[PDB]
Amino acid sequence: GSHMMEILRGSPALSAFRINKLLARFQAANLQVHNIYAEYVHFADLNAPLNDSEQAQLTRLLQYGPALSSHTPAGKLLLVTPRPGTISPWSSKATDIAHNCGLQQVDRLERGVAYYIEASTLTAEQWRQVAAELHDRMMETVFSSLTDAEKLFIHHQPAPVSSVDLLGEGRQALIDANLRLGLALAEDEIDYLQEAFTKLGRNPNDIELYMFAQANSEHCRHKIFNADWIIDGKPQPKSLFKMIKNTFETTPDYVLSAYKDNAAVMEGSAVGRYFADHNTGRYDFHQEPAHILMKVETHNHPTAISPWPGAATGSGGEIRDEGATGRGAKPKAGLVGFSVSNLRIPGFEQPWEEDFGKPERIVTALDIMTEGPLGGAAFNNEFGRPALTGYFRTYEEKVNSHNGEELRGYHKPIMLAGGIGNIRADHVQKGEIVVGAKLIVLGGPAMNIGLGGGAASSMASGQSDAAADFASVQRDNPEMERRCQEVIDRCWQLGDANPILFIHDVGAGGLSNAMPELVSDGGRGGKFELRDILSDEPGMSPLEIWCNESQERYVLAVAADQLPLFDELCKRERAPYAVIGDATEEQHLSLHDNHFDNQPIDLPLDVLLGKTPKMTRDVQTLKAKGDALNRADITIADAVKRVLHLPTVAEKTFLVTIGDRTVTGMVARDQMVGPWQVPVADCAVTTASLDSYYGEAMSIGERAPVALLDFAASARLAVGEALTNIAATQIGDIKRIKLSANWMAAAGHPGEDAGLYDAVKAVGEELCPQLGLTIPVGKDSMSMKTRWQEGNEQREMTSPLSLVISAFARVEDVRHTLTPQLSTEDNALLLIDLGKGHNALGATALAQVYRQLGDKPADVRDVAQLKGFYDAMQALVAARKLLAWHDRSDGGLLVTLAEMAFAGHCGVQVDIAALGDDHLAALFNEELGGVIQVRAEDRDAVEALLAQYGLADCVHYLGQALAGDRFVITANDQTVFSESRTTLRVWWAETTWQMQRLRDNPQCADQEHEAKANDTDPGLNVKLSFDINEDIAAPYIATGARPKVAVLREQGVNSHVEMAAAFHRAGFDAIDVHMSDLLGGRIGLGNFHALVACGGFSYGDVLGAGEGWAKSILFNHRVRDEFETFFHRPQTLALGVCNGCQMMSNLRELIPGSELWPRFVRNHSDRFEARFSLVEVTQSPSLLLQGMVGSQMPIAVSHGEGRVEVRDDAHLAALESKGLVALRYVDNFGKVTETYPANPNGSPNGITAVTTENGRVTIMMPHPERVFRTVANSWHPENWGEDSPWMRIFRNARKQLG
């Protein structure tokens, strides 16, 4: 009923560098702005009053963030808020916090930014340009009063169903509805619906038509992939889908599920799966097969409109598909892909770049590469999966391709998200759905988001309208999805008692696709009640309820008798759920509305799900002639410089360190390699469990520009490069490697349809069967083109046919993986040239950087040799004969060699006289293959091994890696190219420099860049004060007496399992203690002598990282007392890591000896930092760091709010003089530092761990529990065994308890 809104003023919102960025942009647009100041403002919509104690609680909940200096407001107020009718994810999370702090009076919290602008003239026109700079027009609105925020909370009554009057108007009623609702129905679909509803004798409701329209969109139905074809006048025998399935028919080996779920599954390894038992709450290893699931998809349309949520929800949706595999499974690691047009970075424009214009209503390529990666990472970080491999291509050029001179590019981008997960053997096959099964929606209360995303993603970009653009603006709440994943995990961890009978993602078409798909897959019908669906928008129509594409939702069926167990599981995780229907024997779909007393849907399923006829595509081959590369302005030296400046080639740190690479404690090989943490790893590798060296690998291959000359060569190169990227990982049989094939095309663009067919046939009927590669999963995105008016003229930007191949494989031993990090021991560099001397230059980075396409591209030259290459590499890996590997891809041999020299921080001396007279072609061709490094004494044996696989004539001794800074390429006695390695490495870094500079704190960006120019940097290096191998806990463990540790987690924590496992190894019984367990009386801290607060994103860090977790404790007097009691005991030990460190810092008042502790706030860079950082252990009372003082070693860092902040210099000095600092960032020279990224977060005096006066409580931002295994350390000394130095923390805890 009646509500009231409270306004609570917040903290200053913008740091000085962001304030200056705005002032410079106003200056640059001739807007005389003299000053700008911004404060956060909070809006609390209340359903009943707060007493003084409750109000002070709310005020305290709304104190967070860096303590920037406050100003009295002056000048003109512009308030930026979410647009009315939308609810921010901030609101969802901040409101949860208020509820878990016992403020049930809060209906909703929302936040805005109040800007105060002091300006000169400014016409009201100039005031609109000011407002335009301060907000995102796709998600936010600008208001002139704080009281205008009342508009965000308006109560709306439910809108009724609308019927479409077929009986009273005939077919015209359907034609009109088609246009009005944007159904995009073909004529034969209108005929089908006309007849269906004629036969039923009643008018269709809007909801029924909309549901049908989204289900029959290209995006949902895959008509092109199921079409018959005629090509150059000849009917073809197979659909594209069937050509793909041919690879499964040929190679079924190791596959457990293909084309039957939203993920493929393959065999894994029998290992210890580590999780907490349902009955005891104790973490234990369960020895069993951990099979491997895989999936890759895209989110291309929405990302062109709103890239952050487009990227974020692309990850989100893919992660739902993984979790919804079989009867429930567990996402493990991600991959990420982007293809965009030229960046045209201001002040850093490159010579191949020309501005060709774009639609007004899509964003730029730069804006996609700025906001998009941050959204994808935001999801992966908050959900808690590491992101370990990826690609990033730029391409935008006017080229003479298959359809003559045209603009080819990515104005509509590729935004790709994928991953692998683990699954139990008895959960791979979907279960049957019993009649009477309860049909549940797990996850977030819905809103009117993304409505018609199925149809909207089935058409070209540009030339839209405002309403369809708003409907392309997605919304992500990763913490909601983590809560759901926890429920799914509890389910599958019940084994034979998993109550999930069937589960599926909620994606395109929303419930309208997902619920009918679910009952249909079980051979049932369903009857549903509209008003049982959770809603955050009471105004929605039945059509909006049923069809919206709100995020973080799953559908599942459970037996009625398992509902009480399901409800327990949900409530413990705080995962919202609703029973919304029942499965029926009758194959009918009914949706009832208790509010309006009527029946929005009443359809037989065969009517609803029936199909118009199959498509037939009758198309013609076009083939580009292609022109020899004009080398007039090309020199080797200039080409080097340009190629290292192509983003596709250039260093990718901007995309890498924004995303967590260590969550789970199972990451063995991330993108960053070696002591200088250079992002060149060719594939990702994870361990299968926390107790095994078996694992999983991921790689990507893609080569779209090649499809501008040769469709089939492009698809063969994508598969070949996926293989050459994975090949130095210990796999064995090539049939263990499984592919996802993701096809992006502008279907209908001249030449592309035939090209697509040819390319699918090239890999599905030919190459993959001949190699023994299965493609058990895949997807397609068939409208990769953008049209707009540029002056008086029509313009179009069409993508090349763009196949992205992801490769997945069970790994036999993760320890044996090679990287590009050159050794300088005596060595030989050998090139494996799978190009057989073809040395093609067409559609290379070289061609692109001189604005050309060239003549003939690379291609798979010899299938047997490609297989022999793989098998030879597997032989060399297993026999431990390789020091290094790096494959050849974008940028050619030149770039492979350069990148190895960068990773090894060394030089090379190579001769290319054997690779042909054309040195430009030898160095810049992008033929398959790469460079191995071997010990000099092994050269002859390695060459004989290669020869056994038929490769002798492709193998060429190049030379050696050498200490120092010289990169030298000779041919006989001539120097072909010679340059400082450091100069080349800096050039190769300039793209990430400029991206980080424009996106992050430019001071940090500059510091990181400039460090790369100092060749004397020794890289990460270790000094140990103790014996890493000495298990000081062993005598305790040998008694069999295992003390408990409370492994504490809140909603949104994601780092608890590996924390449990670290303590386990040290001899503890690790107990899963959720904050709901404490609030419910199921666990009491009095039964524990040790507690650990784990990492993650509790409440999505809304209201300050760790703050909602801590304030939930403080505001419940019972739980508050419990924690105080624990910390005031004389012998108890507690550890807070990352989110747990932040939480415990906010609980100071309960912890003795903590009065000098700092706060932890937004990093100085203004960016999430996923780093492998060097720290030193400093002298303090900390009992957990005993024996380790003076040690220096690297550790996993993964945080956005890790900066120590003190009240004033007095506080810093007091802390330091008390001697409570326990860890500090050091640079690679070993000195305490504040320079970035050696110190990733800007903490004064490098501080990143503190302890209490008694030593019994220690808090730290880095993650020792992610790196307690040597194998999980991105770089480490070669002589280490199983345990890293960090294992000593947990062993210290065990010894301390006695």
Ligand X SMILES: Nc1ncnc2c1ncn2[C@@H]1O[C@H](COP(=O)(O)OP(=O)(O)O)[C@@H](O)[C@H]1O
Smallest distance, ligand X to C-beta of residue 770, A? 23
1064 is catalytic: no
Sequential DSSP letters for 249-300: HH--TTEEESSSSSSEEEEEEEEEEEEE-TTT-BEEEEEEEEEEEEEEEE-H
71 is catalytic: no
687 marked among binding-site residues: no
Placement of tokens 């965000």 in the chain = 152
The entry of ligand X, Mg ion, ligand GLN, none near residue 1138 (CB within 5 to 8 angstroms by kind) is: ligand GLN
Site string for Mg ion, 666-705 (x = CB under 5 A): ----------------x-----------------------
414 marked among binding-site residues: no
Q: Retrieve residue 617's tokens.
A: 């595509």
The entry of Mg ion, ligand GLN, ligand X, none near residue 1101 (CB within 5 to 8 angstroms by kind) is: ligand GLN
**Residues 15-22: contacts with CB under 8 Å, at least 24 apart:** 15/66, 15/68, 15/1001, 15/1166, 17/1001, 17/1002, 17/1003, 17/1166, 18/1166, 22/133, 22/134
Read off the amino acid at residue 712.
A
| C-beta separation of 745 from 619 below 8 A | no
Q: Where are the beta strands (DSSP E) in 47-152?
A: 76-82, 106-119, 140-143
Q: Which stretch of DSSP H or E encloses residue 999?
A: helix 981-999
Between CA 358 and CA 368 the distance in angstroms is 13
Residue closer to ligand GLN (CB basis): 81 or 1274: 1274
Give the closest residue to 817 by CA, choosing from 724, 727, 698. 727
Smallest distance, ligand GLN to C-beta of residue 59, A? 23
323 marked among binding-site residues: no
Indicate the residue whose CB is closest to Mg ion.
682
Placement of tokens 């088609």 in the chain = 178
314 marked among binding-site residues: yes
316 marked among binding-site residues: yes
Between CA 646 and CA 892 the distance in angstroms is 13
Residue closer to ligand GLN (CB basis): 15 or 226: 15
The entry of Mg ion, ligand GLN, ligand X, none near residue 461 (CB within 5 to 8 angstroms by kind) is: none
Q: Look at strands 502-505 and 884-887 and give their pairing.
A: unpaired
Residue closer to ligand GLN (CB basis): 255 or 1070: 1070
Smallest distance, ligand GLN to C-beta of residue 1050, A? 11
Give how far Cα 51 sits from Cα of 1, 833, 1140, Å: 20, 77, 31
Cβ-Cβ contacts under 8 Å for 945 (sequence gap 6 or more): 872, 875, 876, 881
Cβ-Cβ contacts under 8 Å for 404 (sequence gap 6 or more): none
Residue closer to ligand X (CB basis): 845 or 920: 845
721 marked among binding-site residues: yes
Smallest distance, ligand X to C-beta of residue 340, A? 11
Q: Which residues bind ligand X (CB under 6 A)?
A: 336-338, 387, 389-392, 652, 655-656, 671, 679-682, 725, 889-890
Which residue stretch of 222-230, 530-538, 879-887, 957-965 sits at the interface with Mg ion (rule: CB under 5 A)? 879-887
The entry of ligand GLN, Mg ion, ligand X, none near residue 1200 (CB within 5 to 8 angstroms by kind) is: ligand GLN
Longest dimension (CA), the chain: 91
| C-beta separation of 447 from 87 below 8 A | yes
Q: Look at strands 1090-1093 and 1133-1137 and give their pairing.
A: parallel
1030 is catalytic: no
Q: Which of 1138, 1164, 1176, 1201 is catalytic?
A: 1138
Residue closer to Mg ion (CB basis): 414 or 518: 414
Sequential DSSP letters for 1104-1173: STTHHHHHHHHTSHHHHHHHHHHHTSSS-EEEEETHHHHHHHTTGGGSTT-TT--EEE--TTSS-EEEEE
850 marked among binding-site residues: no
Smallest distance, ligand X to C-beta of residue 776, A? 22
Query: CA quadruple 1145, 1151, 1152, 1155: dihedral positive or negative?
Result: positive
887 marked among binding-site residues: yes
Give the closest residue to 273 by CA, choosing from 137, 425, 155. 425
| C-beta separation of 798 from 749 below 8 A | yes
**Other C-beta atoms lying within 10 Å of the C-beta of residue 972:** 8
Q: Which of 382, 549, 1169, 1265 is catalytic?
A: 1265
312 marked among binding-site residues: yes
Indicate the residue whose CB is closest to ligand X.
390
Smallest distance, ligand X to C-beta of residue 534, A? 34
Q: Which residues pair with 45 in a beta bridge?
A: 5, 108
Placement of tokens 């708003």 in the chain = 470
Placement of tokens 């926390």 in the chain = 690
410 marked among binding-site residues: no
Smallest distance, ligand X to C-beta of residue 892, A? 11
725 marked among binding-site residues: yes
Smallest distance, ligand X to C-beta of residue 671, A? 3
Residue closer to ligand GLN (CB basis): 63 or 599: 63
Residue closer to ligand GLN (CB basis): 114 or 1206: 1206
Q: Retrieve residue 47's tokens.
A: 């359903």
310 marked among binding-site residues: yes
Give how far Cα 339 sits from Cα of 299, 391, 453, 744, 838, Å: 12, 8, 21, 11, 28
| C-beta separation of 1126 from 1091 below 8 A | yes
Query: CA quadruple 1180, 1186, 1188, 1193: dihedral positive or negative?
Result: negative
Please tell me the total number of residues recorded for the chain in this structure.
1298
Between CA 4 and CA 209 the distance in angstroms is 39
Q: Which residues bind ligand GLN (CB under 6 A)?
A: 1055, 1095-1097, 1101, 1105, 1138-1139, 1198-1202
The entry of Mg ion, ligand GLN, ligand X, none near residue 336 (CB within 5 to 8 angstroms by kind) is: ligand X
121 marked among binding-site residues: no
Q: Which of 504, 919, 1164, 1263 is catalytic?
A: 1263
315 marked among binding-site residues: yes
Smallest distance, ligand X to C-beta of residue 896, A? 9
Placement of tokens 């032989």 in the chain = 875
Smallest distance, ligand X to C-beta of residue 679, A? 4
| C-beta separation of 441 from 580 below 8 A | yes
Residue selected from 889, 1146, 1178, 1258 as contacting Mg ion according to rule CB under 5 A: 889
Residue closer to ligand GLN (CB basis): 365 or 1138: 1138
681 marked among binding-site residues: yes
Between CA 208 and CA 966 the distance in angstroms is 69
- Residues in region 523-542 near Mg ion by CB under 5 A: none
Residue closer to ligand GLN (CB basis): 309 or 478: 478
Smallest distance, ligand X to C-beta of residue 724, A? 9
Between CA 869 and CA 285 the distance in angstroms is 38
Catalytically active residues are 1138, 1263, 1265
- The residues of the shown chain that bind Mg ion, judged by CB under 5 A, are 682, 725, 887, 889-890
Which residues fall in the annotated binding site?
310-321, 389-391, 681-682, 721, 725, 887, 889
Which residues fall in the annotated binding site for Mg(2+)?
682, 721, 725, 887
Which residues fall in the annotated binding site for ATP?
310-321, 389-391, 681, 889
